[PDB]
Amino acid sequence: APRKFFVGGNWKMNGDKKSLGELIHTLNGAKLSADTEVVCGAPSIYLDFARQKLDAKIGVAAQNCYKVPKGAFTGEISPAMIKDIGAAWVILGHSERRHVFGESDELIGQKVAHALAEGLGVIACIGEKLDEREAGITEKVVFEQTKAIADNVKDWSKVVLAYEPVWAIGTGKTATPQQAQEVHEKLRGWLKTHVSDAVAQSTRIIYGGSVTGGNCKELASQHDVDGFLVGGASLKPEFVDIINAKH
Amino acid sequence: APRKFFVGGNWKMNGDKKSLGELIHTLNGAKLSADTEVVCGAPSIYLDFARQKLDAKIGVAAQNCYKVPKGAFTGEISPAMIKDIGAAWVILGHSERRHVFGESDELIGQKVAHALAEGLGVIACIGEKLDEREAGITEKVVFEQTKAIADNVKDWSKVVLAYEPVWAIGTGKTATPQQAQEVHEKLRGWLKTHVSDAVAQSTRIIYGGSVTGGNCKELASQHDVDGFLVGGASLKPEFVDIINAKH
Protein backbone atom coordinates (compact mmCIF):
# COMPACT_ATOMS: atom_id res chain seq x y z
CA ALA A 1 0.00 0.00 0.00
CA PRO A 2 1.10 3.70 -0.18
CA ARG A 3 3.59 3.46 2.72
CA LYS A 4 3.72 5.87 5.54
CA PHE A 5 6.76 7.72 6.74
CA PHE A 6 7.94 6.17 9.94
CA VAL A 7 10.21 7.69 12.58
CA GLY A 8 11.51 5.84 15.62
CA GLY A 9 13.16 7.31 18.63
CA ASN A 10 15.59 4.76 20.17
CA TRP A 11 16.67 6.23 23.56
CA LYS A 12 19.06 3.41 24.50
CA MET A 13 20.33 3.49 28.07
CA ASN A 14 19.83 7.24 28.49
CA GLY A 15 17.83 9.67 30.58
CA ASP A 16 15.92 9.73 33.80
CA LYS A 17 12.40 10.77 34.49
CA LYS A 18 13.25 14.46 34.83
CA SER A 19 15.27 14.76 31.66
CA LEU A 20 12.91 12.52 29.73
CA GLY A 21 9.64 14.15 30.75
CA GLU A 22 11.30 17.34 29.52
CA LEU A 23 11.82 15.51 26.21
CA ILE A 24 8.27 14.23 26.10
CA HIS A 25 6.93 17.65 27.07
CA THR A 26 8.74 19.13 24.12
CA LEU A 27 7.30 16.43 21.94
CA ASN A 28 3.86 16.37 23.20
CA GLY A 29 4.02 20.09 22.56
CA ALA A 30 5.63 20.08 19.06
CA LYS A 31 3.79 20.33 15.65
CA LEU A 32 4.24 17.07 13.69
CA SER A 33 2.61 15.93 10.51
CA ALA A 34 0.72 12.73 10.12
CA ASP A 35 2.30 11.31 7.02
CA THR A 36 4.71 10.53 9.73
CA GLU A 37 4.26 7.70 12.06
CA VAL A 38 6.21 8.28 15.32
CA VAL A 39 7.43 5.89 17.99
CA CYS A 40 9.64 6.20 21.09
CA GLY A 41 11.53 3.44 22.61
CA ALA A 42 12.34 3.91 26.24
CA PRO A 43 14.58 2.01 28.67
CA SER A 44 12.23 -0.52 30.42
CA ILE A 45 11.98 1.12 33.85
CA TYR A 46 10.76 4.13 31.86
CA LEU A 47 8.23 2.44 29.63
CA ASP A 48 5.10 2.99 31.70
CA PHE A 49 6.00 6.39 32.82
CA ALA A 50 6.41 7.27 29.20
CA ARG A 51 3.26 5.76 27.83
CA GLN A 52 1.63 7.68 30.67
CA LYS A 53 3.24 11.02 29.80
CA LEU A 54 3.29 10.59 26.00
CA ASP A 55 0.34 11.65 23.89
CA ALA A 56 -1.79 9.07 22.10
CA LYS A 57 -0.37 10.66 18.93
CA ILE A 58 2.93 8.94 19.82
CA GLY A 59 3.57 5.20 20.07
CA VAL A 60 5.89 3.62 22.61
CA ALA A 61 8.36 0.83 21.90
CA ALA A 62 10.29 -1.35 24.29
CA GLN A 63 13.99 -1.65 23.24
CA ASN A 64 13.92 -5.48 23.57
CA CYS A 65 11.88 -8.47 25.01
CA TYR A 66 12.14 -12.26 25.28
CA LYS A 67 10.13 -15.03 23.47
CA VAL A 68 8.10 -16.39 26.30
CA PRO A 69 5.33 -14.74 28.17
CA LYS A 70 6.32 -15.93 31.69
CA GLY A 71 9.01 -17.38 33.80
CA ALA A 72 12.39 -18.34 35.01
CA PHE A 73 14.04 -15.58 32.98
CA THR A 74 15.72 -13.27 35.52
CA GLY A 75 16.26 -9.83 34.02
CA GLU A 76 13.85 -10.29 31.08
CA ILE A 77 10.45 -8.73 30.31
CA SER A 78 7.73 -10.19 28.13
CA PRO A 79 5.63 -9.05 25.22
CA ALA A 80 2.67 -9.32 27.61
CA MET A 81 4.46 -7.05 30.07
CA ILE A 82 5.07 -4.63 27.31
CA LYS A 83 1.46 -4.78 26.30
CA ASP A 84 0.23 -4.65 29.79
CA ILE A 85 1.76 -1.23 30.01
CA GLY A 86 0.30 0.07 26.76
CA ALA A 87 3.40 -0.06 24.59
CA ALA A 88 2.68 -1.58 21.18
CA TRP A 89 6.07 -1.96 19.60
CA VAL A 90 9.28 -3.75 20.40
CA ILE A 91 12.56 -2.88 18.76
CA LEU A 92 14.37 -6.13 18.07
CA GLY A 93 17.64 -7.38 16.62
CA HIS A 94 19.40 -4.24 17.55
CA SER A 95 23.05 -4.11 16.74
CA GLU A 96 24.13 -3.66 20.35
CA ARG A 97 22.31 -6.86 21.29
CA ARG A 98 23.43 -8.76 18.32
CA HIS A 99 26.92 -7.65 19.15
CA VAL A 100 27.39 -6.89 22.74
CA PHE A 101 24.85 -9.36 24.10
CA GLY A 102 25.50 -11.88 21.38
CA GLU A 103 21.89 -12.37 20.32
CA SER A 104 21.56 -15.02 17.60
CA ASP A 105 19.75 -14.82 14.36
CA GLU A 106 17.73 -17.83 15.65
CA LEU A 107 17.09 -16.15 18.94
CA ILE A 108 16.06 -13.02 17.17
CA GLY A 109 13.75 -14.83 14.88
CA GLN A 110 12.00 -16.41 17.76
CA LYS A 111 11.51 -13.00 19.41
CA VAL A 112 9.98 -11.85 16.24
CA ALA A 113 7.51 -14.68 15.96
CA HIS A 114 6.62 -14.43 19.69
CA ALA A 115 6.16 -10.66 19.62
CA LEU A 116 3.88 -11.00 16.59
CA ALA A 117 1.78 -13.78 18.06
CA GLU A 118 1.20 -11.54 21.11
CA GLY A 119 0.15 -8.68 18.89
CA LEU A 120 2.89 -6.07 19.29
CA GLY A 121 4.31 -4.41 16.08
CA VAL A 122 8.00 -4.93 15.46
CA ILE A 123 10.89 -2.89 14.07
CA ALA A 124 13.60 -5.48 13.26
CA CYS A 125 17.16 -4.64 12.55
CA ILE A 126 19.73 -5.91 10.16
CA GLY A 127 23.14 -4.42 9.29
CA GLU A 128 26.69 -5.40 8.39
CA LYS A 129 29.98 -4.59 10.12
CA LEU A 130 32.85 -2.48 8.66
CA ASP A 131 34.64 -5.71 7.93
CA GLU A 132 31.59 -7.21 6.42
CA ARG A 133 31.16 -4.14 4.33
CA GLU A 134 34.88 -4.09 3.50
CA ALA A 135 35.06 -7.77 2.63
CA GLY A 136 32.40 -7.00 0.03
CA ILE A 137 29.85 -9.28 1.85
CA THR A 138 27.14 -6.82 2.85
CA GLU A 139 24.44 -8.51 0.77
CA LYS A 140 25.00 -11.99 2.02
CA VAL A 141 24.79 -10.80 5.63
CA VAL A 142 21.93 -8.42 5.45
CA PHE A 143 20.16 -11.14 3.46
CA GLU A 144 20.89 -13.86 6.04
CA GLN A 145 19.69 -11.53 8.73
CA THR A 146 16.56 -10.67 6.85
CA LYS A 147 15.61 -14.21 5.94
CA ALA A 148 16.05 -15.31 9.56
CA ILE A 149 13.40 -12.66 10.27
CA ALA A 150 11.24 -13.37 7.30
CA ASP A 151 11.10 -17.00 8.10
CA ASN A 152 9.33 -15.90 11.27
CA VAL A 153 6.85 -13.28 10.18
CA LYS A 154 3.33 -14.43 9.23
CA ASP A 155 2.05 -10.84 8.88
CA TRP A 156 4.29 -8.16 7.52
CA SER A 157 1.74 -5.48 8.42
CA LYS A 158 2.98 -4.91 12.03
CA VAL A 159 6.58 -5.03 10.71
CA VAL A 160 9.29 -2.46 10.09
CA LEU A 161 12.76 -3.19 8.86
CA ALA A 162 15.53 -0.96 10.17
CA TYR A 163 18.72 -1.06 8.20
CA GLU A 164 21.67 -0.09 10.33
CA PRO A 165 25.11 0.10 8.76
CA VAL A 166 26.99 -0.76 11.96
CA TRP A 167 29.98 -0.62 9.82
CA ALA A 168 29.48 2.95 9.95
CA ILE A 169 28.09 5.01 12.81
CA GLY A 170 30.98 4.65 15.41
CA THR A 171 34.03 4.73 13.06
CA GLY A 172 33.52 8.03 11.23
CA LYS A 173 32.30 7.83 7.61
CA THR A 174 29.28 8.11 5.33
CA ALA A 175 26.11 6.17 5.13
CA THR A 176 25.77 8.54 2.20
CA PRO A 177 22.19 8.64 0.91
CA GLN A 178 23.50 6.67 -2.00
CA GLN A 179 25.10 3.80 -0.13
CA ALA A 180 22.00 3.77 2.06
CA GLN A 181 19.59 3.86 -0.97
CA GLU A 182 21.34 0.79 -2.34
CA VAL A 183 20.87 -1.61 0.53
CA HIS A 184 17.27 -0.26 0.88
CA GLU A 185 16.66 -1.04 -2.78
CA LYS A 186 18.15 -4.59 -2.59
CA LEU A 187 16.30 -5.51 0.66
CA ARG A 188 12.98 -4.48 -0.82
CA GLY A 189 13.96 -6.40 -3.93
CA TRP A 190 14.88 -9.32 -1.67
CA LEU A 191 11.53 -9.38 0.01
CA LYS A 192 9.82 -9.00 -3.31
CA THR A 193 11.60 -12.02 -4.56
CA HIS A 194 11.47 -14.06 -1.32
CA VAL A 195 8.03 -12.98 -0.11
CA SER A 196 5.64 -11.13 -2.42
CA ASP A 197 5.73 -7.79 -4.16
CA ALA A 198 2.61 -7.27 -2.14
CA VAL A 199 4.76 -7.44 0.96
CA ALA A 200 7.62 -5.67 -0.75
CA GLN A 201 5.50 -2.66 -1.36
CA SER A 202 3.77 -2.53 2.02
CA THR A 203 6.90 -2.71 4.14
CA ARG A 204 8.63 0.27 5.48
CA ILE A 205 12.40 -0.11 5.40
CA ILE A 206 13.82 2.62 7.66
CA TYR A 207 17.25 3.94 7.68
CA GLY A 208 19.14 3.55 10.83
CA GLY A 209 22.73 4.86 10.45
CA SER A 210 23.53 8.25 12.16
CA VAL A 211 20.56 10.50 11.41
CA THR A 212 20.44 14.17 12.31
CA GLY A 213 18.75 17.48 11.86
CA GLY A 214 21.33 18.36 9.08
CA ASN A 215 21.16 14.95 7.53
CA CYS A 216 17.61 13.73 7.36
CA LYS A 217 16.23 15.67 4.35
CA GLU A 218 18.87 14.14 2.13
CA LEU A 219 18.13 10.68 3.35
CA ALA A 220 14.36 11.03 3.35
CA SER A 221 14.62 12.35 -0.15
CA GLN A 222 15.85 8.99 -1.39
CA HIS A 223 13.55 6.59 -3.21
CA ASP A 224 13.48 3.48 -0.99
CA VAL A 225 14.06 4.86 2.51
CA ASP A 226 10.78 4.94 4.44
CA GLY A 227 12.08 6.75 7.62
CA PHE A 228 14.48 6.28 10.45
CA LEU A 229 15.51 4.47 13.48
CA VAL A 230 16.96 7.50 15.41
CA GLY A 231 19.47 7.35 18.20
CA GLY A 232 21.57 10.10 19.71
CA ALA A 233 19.50 12.82 18.07
CA SER A 234 16.26 11.27 19.41
CA LEU A 235 17.24 12.76 22.80
CA LYS A 236 17.12 16.44 21.68
CA PRO A 237 14.53 18.82 20.24
CA GLU A 238 16.21 18.08 16.84
CA PHE A 239 14.05 14.98 16.59
CA VAL A 240 11.06 17.18 15.77
CA ASP A 241 13.12 18.38 12.91
CA ILE A 242 13.77 14.82 11.90
CA ILE A 243 10.17 13.71 12.36
CA ASN A 244 9.00 16.53 10.03
CA ALA A 245 11.93 15.76 7.66
CA LYS A 246 10.31 14.66 4.46
CA HIS A 247 8.82 18.11 4.10
CA ALA B 1 26.66 -7.71 65.29
CA PRO B 2 24.51 -10.85 64.82
CA ARG B 3 23.88 -11.15 61.01
CA LYS B 4 20.38 -9.80 59.97
CA PHE B 5 18.08 -12.40 58.40
CA PHE B 6 17.67 -11.74 54.76
CA VAL B 7 14.72 -12.64 52.58
CA GLY B 8 14.96 -11.58 48.92
CA GLY B 9 12.02 -12.55 46.72
CA ASN B 10 12.75 -13.02 43.03
CA TRP B 11 9.71 -12.54 40.74
CA LYS B 12 11.65 -13.38 37.61
CA MET B 13 9.67 -12.82 34.40
CA ASN B 14 6.33 -13.13 36.10
CA GLY B 15 3.46 -10.77 36.98
CA ASP B 16 1.21 -8.02 35.65
CA LYS B 17 0.08 -4.82 37.30
CA LYS B 18 -3.15 -6.45 38.41
CA SER B 19 -1.62 -9.55 40.00
CA LEU B 20 1.45 -7.84 41.24
CA GLY B 21 -0.76 -5.16 42.78
CA GLU B 22 -2.69 -7.90 44.43
CA LEU B 23 0.39 -9.27 46.24
CA ILE B 24 1.92 -5.92 46.99
CA HIS B 25 -1.42 -5.75 48.73
CA THR B 26 -1.06 -8.95 50.87
CA LEU B 27 2.55 -8.10 51.61
CA ASN B 28 1.99 -4.50 52.66
CA GLY B 29 -0.65 -5.53 55.10
CA ALA B 30 1.11 -8.44 56.78
CA LYS B 31 3.11 -8.26 59.97
CA LEU B 32 6.58 -9.33 59.22
CA SER B 33 9.41 -9.64 61.67
CA ALA B 34 11.42 -6.42 62.01
CA ASP B 35 14.19 -8.93 62.58
CA THR B 36 14.02 -9.82 58.91
CA GLU B 37 15.20 -7.83 55.96
CA VAL B 38 13.04 -8.08 52.86
CA VAL B 39 13.55 -7.14 49.27
CA CYS B 40 11.46 -7.94 46.11
CA GLY B 41 12.93 -8.31 42.65
CA ALA B 42 10.45 -7.08 40.09
CA PRO B 43 10.73 -7.13 36.32
CA SER B 44 12.35 -3.88 35.06
CA ILE B 45 9.06 -2.68 33.45
CA TYR B 46 7.48 -2.87 36.98
CA LEU B 47 10.18 -1.46 39.23
CA ASP B 48 8.62 2.07 39.62
CA PHE B 49 5.10 0.72 40.17
CA ALA B 50 6.61 -1.74 42.64
CA ARG B 51 8.48 1.03 44.31
CA GLN B 52 5.43 3.16 44.34
CA LYS B 53 3.21 0.55 46.03
CA LEU B 54 5.47 -1.49 48.25
CA ASP B 55 5.47 -0.44 51.83
CA ALA B 56 8.64 1.51 52.62
CA LYS B 57 9.82 -1.27 54.96
CA ILE B 58 10.05 -3.61 52.02
CA GLY B 59 13.11 -3.20 49.68
CA VAL B 60 13.06 -3.18 45.86
CA ALA B 61 15.61 -4.82 43.73
CA ALA B 62 16.24 -4.73 39.98
CA GLN B 63 16.84 -8.20 38.52
CA ASN B 64 19.85 -7.11 36.43
CA CYS B 65 21.61 -3.88 35.23
CA TYR B 66 24.60 -2.95 32.98
CA LYS B 67 28.17 -1.81 33.87
CA VAL B 68 27.43 1.78 32.89
CA PRO B 69 25.56 4.89 33.79
CA LYS B 70 24.51 5.63 30.20
CA GLY B 71 25.00 4.61 26.65
CA ALA B 72 24.57 2.89 23.43
CA PHE B 73 23.31 -0.29 25.06
CA THR B 74 19.94 -1.00 23.57
CA GLY B 75 17.80 -2.79 26.00
CA GLU B 76 19.87 -2.27 29.13
CA ILE B 77 19.30 -0.50 32.41
CA SER B 78 21.80 1.26 34.65
CA PRO B 79 22.05 1.35 38.40
CA ALA B 80 21.55 5.03 38.03
CA MET B 81 18.18 4.38 36.59
CA ILE B 82 17.50 1.94 39.41
CA LYS B 83 18.37 4.62 41.94
CA ASP B 84 16.08 7.03 40.08
CA ILE B 85 12.81 5.02 40.61
CA GLY B 86 14.04 4.75 44.14
CA ALA B 87 15.10 1.05 44.17
CA ALA B 88 18.06 0.07 46.37
CA TRP B 89 19.20 -3.40 45.28
CA VAL B 90 20.29 -5.26 42.17
CA ILE B 91 20.50 -9.06 41.80
CA LEU B 92 23.68 -9.94 39.90
CA GLY B 93 24.91 -13.13 38.33
CA HIS B 94 21.71 -15.20 38.73
CA SER B 95 22.09 -18.65 37.13
CA GLU B 96 19.52 -17.69 34.44
CA ARG B 97 21.59 -14.73 33.28
CA ARG B 98 24.65 -16.86 33.60
CA HIS B 99 23.40 -19.91 31.64
CA VAL B 100 20.46 -18.72 29.65
CA PHE B 101 22.21 -15.48 28.77
CA GLY B 102 25.93 -16.14 28.85
CA GLU B 103 26.87 -13.54 31.45
CA SER B 104 30.48 -14.13 32.38
CA ASP B 105 32.49 -14.18 35.53
CA GLU B 106 34.23 -10.97 34.46
CA LEU B 107 31.00 -9.22 33.31
CA ILE B 108 29.27 -9.98 36.59
CA GLY B 109 32.37 -8.67 38.43
CA GLN B 110 32.38 -5.47 36.35
CA LYS B 111 28.71 -5.14 37.22
CA VAL B 112 29.29 -5.55 40.87
CA ALA B 113 31.84 -2.81 41.21
CA HIS B 114 29.69 -0.42 39.21
CA ALA B 115 26.64 -1.17 41.26
CA LEU B 116 28.54 -0.65 44.54
CA ALA B 117 30.30 2.34 43.07
CA GLU B 118 26.90 3.95 42.61
CA GLY B 119 25.32 3.09 45.91
CA LEU B 120 23.22 -0.01 45.36
CA GLY B 121 23.17 -3.09 47.46
CA VAL B 122 24.16 -6.09 45.39
CA ILE B 123 22.83 -9.55 45.81
CA ALA B 124 25.55 -11.60 44.04
CA CYS B 125 24.76 -15.16 42.92
CA ILE B 126 27.13 -18.07 42.67
CA GLY B 127 26.29 -21.85 42.30
CA GLU B 128 27.55 -25.05 40.52
CA LYS B 129 25.92 -27.17 37.82
CA LEU B 130 25.34 -30.93 38.09
CA ASP B 131 28.04 -31.69 35.53
CA GLU B 132 30.26 -29.74 38.04
CA ARG B 133 28.86 -30.99 41.34
CA GLU B 134 29.10 -34.41 39.85
CA ALA B 135 32.72 -34.17 38.75
CA GLY B 136 33.33 -33.06 42.40
CA ILE B 137 34.46 -29.56 41.17
CA THR B 138 32.03 -27.73 43.45
CA GLU B 139 34.41 -25.69 45.61
CA LYS B 140 36.44 -25.08 42.52
CA VAL B 141 33.52 -23.50 40.66
CA VAL B 142 31.88 -21.46 43.42
CA PHE B 143 35.37 -20.36 44.71
CA GLU B 144 36.32 -18.98 41.26
CA GLN B 145 32.80 -17.49 41.03
CA THR B 146 33.30 -15.84 44.47
CA LYS B 147 36.86 -14.84 43.70
CA ALA B 148 35.69 -12.91 40.69
CA ILE B 149 33.11 -10.94 42.78
CA ALA B 150 35.46 -10.45 45.63
CA ASP B 151 38.12 -8.92 43.47
CA ASN B 152 35.58 -6.07 42.80
CA VAL B 153 34.26 -5.48 46.22
CA LYS B 154 35.82 -2.96 48.52
CA ASP B 155 33.04 -2.69 51.05
CA TRP B 156 31.19 -5.89 51.73
CA SER B 157 28.55 -4.13 53.73
CA LYS B 158 26.31 -3.69 50.73
CA VAL B 159 26.74 -7.22 49.54
CA VAL B 160 24.79 -10.35 50.09
CA LEU B 161 26.00 -13.73 48.74
CA ALA B 162 23.33 -16.08 47.29
CA TYR B 163 24.17 -19.76 46.60
CA GLU B 164 22.22 -21.48 43.93
CA PRO B 165 22.25 -25.22 43.70
CA VAL B 166 21.82 -25.24 39.96
CA TRP B 167 22.73 -28.88 39.96
CA ALA B 168 19.42 -29.24 41.82
CA ILE B 169 17.28 -27.29 39.23
CA GLY B 170 15.28 -29.33 36.57
CA THR B 171 17.92 -32.04 37.03
CA GLY B 172 15.54 -34.36 38.75
CA LYS B 173 17.70 -33.78 41.95
CA THR B 174 16.62 -32.73 45.48
CA ALA B 175 19.11 -30.81 47.61
CA THR B 176 19.11 -31.41 51.36
CA PRO B 177 19.50 -28.86 54.16
CA GLN B 178 22.81 -30.37 55.04
CA GLN B 179 23.96 -29.90 51.45
CA ALA B 180 22.96 -26.27 51.70
CA GLN B 181 24.79 -25.77 55.02
CA GLU B 182 27.92 -27.41 53.86
CA VAL B 183 28.29 -25.20 50.90
CA HIS B 184 27.38 -22.21 52.97
CA GLU B 185 29.85 -23.13 55.63
CA LYS B 186 32.46 -23.55 52.88
CA LEU B 187 31.73 -20.11 51.37
CA ARG B 188 32.22 -18.50 54.76
CA GLY B 189 35.52 -20.33 55.30
CA TRP B 190 36.67 -19.04 51.90
CA LEU B 191 35.87 -15.55 53.00
CA LYS B 192 37.86 -15.48 56.16
CA THR B 193 40.72 -17.24 54.25
CA HIS B 194 40.84 -14.88 51.33
CA VAL B 195 39.30 -11.71 52.69
CA SER B 196 38.98 -11.12 56.43
CA ASP B 197 37.53 -12.87 59.41
CA ALA B 198 35.45 -9.75 59.71
CA VAL B 199 33.96 -9.89 56.32
CA ALA B 200 33.29 -13.56 56.83
CA GLN B 201 31.61 -12.83 60.01
CA SER B 202 29.58 -9.94 58.87
CA THR B 203 28.43 -11.24 55.47
CA ARG B 204 25.15 -12.96 54.89
CA ILE B 205 24.98 -16.08 52.75
CA ILE B 206 21.38 -16.69 51.77
CA TYR B 207 20.06 -19.90 50.20
CA GLY B 208 18.99 -19.66 46.50
CA GLY B 209 17.62 -23.22 46.23
CA SER B 210 13.91 -24.13 46.52
CA VAL B 211 12.11 -22.67 49.46
CA THR B 212 8.61 -22.90 50.71
CA GLY B 213 6.57 -22.45 53.81
CA GLY B 214 7.46 -26.17 54.17
CA ASN B 215 11.35 -26.26 54.11
CA CYS B 216 11.86 -22.73 55.20
CA LYS B 217 12.21 -23.34 58.99
CA GLU B 218 14.77 -26.12 58.89
CA LEU B 219 16.71 -24.13 56.46
CA ALA B 220 16.69 -20.94 58.45
CA SER B 221 17.89 -22.99 61.33
CA GLN B 222 20.95 -24.05 59.45
CA HIS B 223 23.93 -22.19 60.82
CA ASP B 224 25.53 -20.61 57.80
CA VAL B 225 22.22 -19.88 56.25
CA ASP B 226 21.35 -16.14 56.64
CA GLY B 227 18.13 -15.87 54.69
CA PHE B 228 17.08 -16.79 51.20
CA LEU B 229 16.55 -15.74 47.65
CA VAL B 230 13.04 -17.04 46.99
CA GLY B 231 11.73 -17.90 43.63
CA GLY B 232 8.21 -19.30 43.21
CA ALA B 233 6.89 -18.75 46.68
CA SER B 234 7.68 -15.06 46.26
CA LEU B 235 4.63 -14.69 44.01
CA LYS B 236 2.45 -16.04 46.83
CA PRO B 237 1.27 -15.20 50.38
CA GLU B 238 3.28 -18.18 51.71
CA PHE B 239 5.98 -15.59 51.02
CA VAL B 240 4.78 -13.94 54.26
CA ASP B 241 5.26 -17.40 55.94
CA ILE B 242 8.80 -17.62 54.58
CA ILE B 243 9.64 -14.10 55.82
CA ASN B 244 8.56 -14.82 59.33
CA ALA B 245 10.47 -18.19 59.53
CA LYS B 246 13.50 -17.67 61.87
CA HIS B 247 11.39 -16.62 64.92
From Swiss-Prot, chains A, B:
Reaction(s) this enzyme catalyzes, per UniProt: dihydroxyacetone phosphate = methylglyoxal + phosphate; D-glyceraldehyde 3-phosphate = dihydroxyacetone phosphate
Pathway as given in its UniProt record: Carbohydrate degradation; glycolysis; D-glyceraldehyde 3-phosphate from glycerone phosphate: step 1/1; Carbohydrate biosynthesis; gluconeogenesis
Active site feature: 94, 164
Xref: PROSITE patterns: TIM_1, TIM_2
Keywords: Cytoplasm, Gluconeogenesis, Glycolysis, Isomerase, Lyase
InterPro entries noted in UniProt: Aldolase_TIM, TIM_sf, TrioseP_Isoase_bac/euk, Triosephosphate_isomerase, Triosephosphate_isomerase_AS
HAMAP family from the UniProt entry: TIM_B
Stated family: Belongs to the triosephosphate isomerase family.
NCBIfam families: tim
Name used for this protein in its record: Triosephosphate isomerase
Organism: Gallus gallus
Lineage: Eukaryota, Metazoa, Chordata, Craniata, Vertebrata
